């Protein structure tokens, strides 16, 4: 723990594009990486305001603050201070598909975390380019070994503010940068809140809690 | 740094054929791959590339739905399954790995390096 401290802040960056406009944002967050928990201030600094909801874009902001159970190796906080990277794909139930990349390292005693998304094929009269979406509801991520990485698979739900919810299939790989022990398969549970925006949403605050069992 | 192609051949239109790229020399998944083909007296191509975990892939608009990339990152194999094969894809098909590591959507020649030589494609 004189890599990962009990309290641990990052700076974040992101470019993206959904069905092809373009942004950036810059964000900074702070946790405490072994009680599973963290908040974040993200603020979008190109092409804002978004024409599309915040909510496919919040689950991109930090799996170094998962807590674990004691006969759990942490795979990403072991991968420190070299890090770790991660991609991602997200199946939208109607079409839509997000691609991240995403790199983590440590400079300086603080996390810097570098994303790219792309988000493509959402509907225009869809809840995602009309902002009509409410915030993810709790999430299970089954986490298992697989190929040298560590890989999660989530089938996750956002509310919709016409009622009922919107699916994603989820799939994501994490992989140290250095030989890292890998763990047995075990679930993550994880809820993202959205605590605080702005009306267009160009200064978002966010809070996620997150614990593995077996 | 060292590539090495395989699977081409001689098919008739219509036919199917898968190519494989051996590597050796690097660490296979910190790199972006990526398969380009060049046809007489034209330019060296892209075809499709894929992303270190496999889940971002691209392709050409002349063979996405018909052609697939993917990669195995415990053989250290890449690979283009070719499928609805027309004579205009005949061509050297050649496999190269990305400049950096961290890519993103990049299909210019120059984004990529360590070129094998190449498998031959004929479609008849």
Same mark, same amino acid.
């Given at each position: 723990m004189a890599i990962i401290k009990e309290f641990m802040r990052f700076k974040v960056h992101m470019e993206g594009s959904v069905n092809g406009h373009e942004f950036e944002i810059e964000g900074e967050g702070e946790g405490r990486p072994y009680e599973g928990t963290q908040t974040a201030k993200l603020k979008?600094? %190109?092409?804002?305001?978004?024409?599309?909801?915040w909510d496919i874009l919040s689950?991109?902001?930090? %799996?170094?603050?998962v807590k674990h159970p004691?006969?759990?190796?942490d795979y990403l906080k072991l991968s420190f201070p070299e890090g770790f990277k991660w991609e991602r794909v997200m199946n939208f139930e109607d079409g839509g598909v997000v691609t991240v990349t995403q790199d983590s390292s440590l400079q300086d005693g603080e996390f810097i975390y570098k994303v790219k998304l792309r988000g493509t *094929?959402?509907?225009?009269?869809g809840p995602v380019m009309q902002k009509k979406t409410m915030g993810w509801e709790a999430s299970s991520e089954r986490m298992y070994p697989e190929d040298g990485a560590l890989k999660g698979e989530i089938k996750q739900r956002l509310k919709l503010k016409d009622g009922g919810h919107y699916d994603a299939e989820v799939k994501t790989t994490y992989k140290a940068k250095k030989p890292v022990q890998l763990p047995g398969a075990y679930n993550v549970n994880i809820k993202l809140d959205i605590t605080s925006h702005n009306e267009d949403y160009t200064i978002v605050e966010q809070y996620e809690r997150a614990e593995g069992r077996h | 740094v060292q590539l090495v192609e395989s699977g081409g051949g001689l098919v008739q239109a219509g036919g199917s054929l898968r190519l494989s790229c051996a590597t050796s020399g690097?660490?296979?998944?910190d790199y972006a791959m990526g398969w380009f083909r060049q046809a007489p007296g034209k330019e060296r191509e892209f075809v499709a590339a894929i992303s270190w975990s496999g889940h971002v892939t691209d392709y050409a608009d002349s063979v996405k739905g018909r052609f697939t990339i993917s990669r195995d990152n415990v053989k250290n194999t890449v690979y283009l399954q070719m499928n609805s094969? %027309?004579?205009?894809?005949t061509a050297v098909y050649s496999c190269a790995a990305a %400049?950096?590591?961290?890519?993103?959507?990049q299909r210019s020649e *120059?984004?990529?390096?360590?070129?094998?030589?190449g498998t031959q494609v004929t479609v008849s």
């Open positions: 979008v600094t %190109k092409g804002g305001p978004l024409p599309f909801a689950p991109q902001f930090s %799996k170094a603050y004691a006969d759990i190796p *094929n959402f509907p225009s009269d | 690097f660490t296979f998944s094969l %027309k004579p205009e894809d %400049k950096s590591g961290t890519w993103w959507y *120059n984004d990529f390096g360590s070129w094998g030589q």
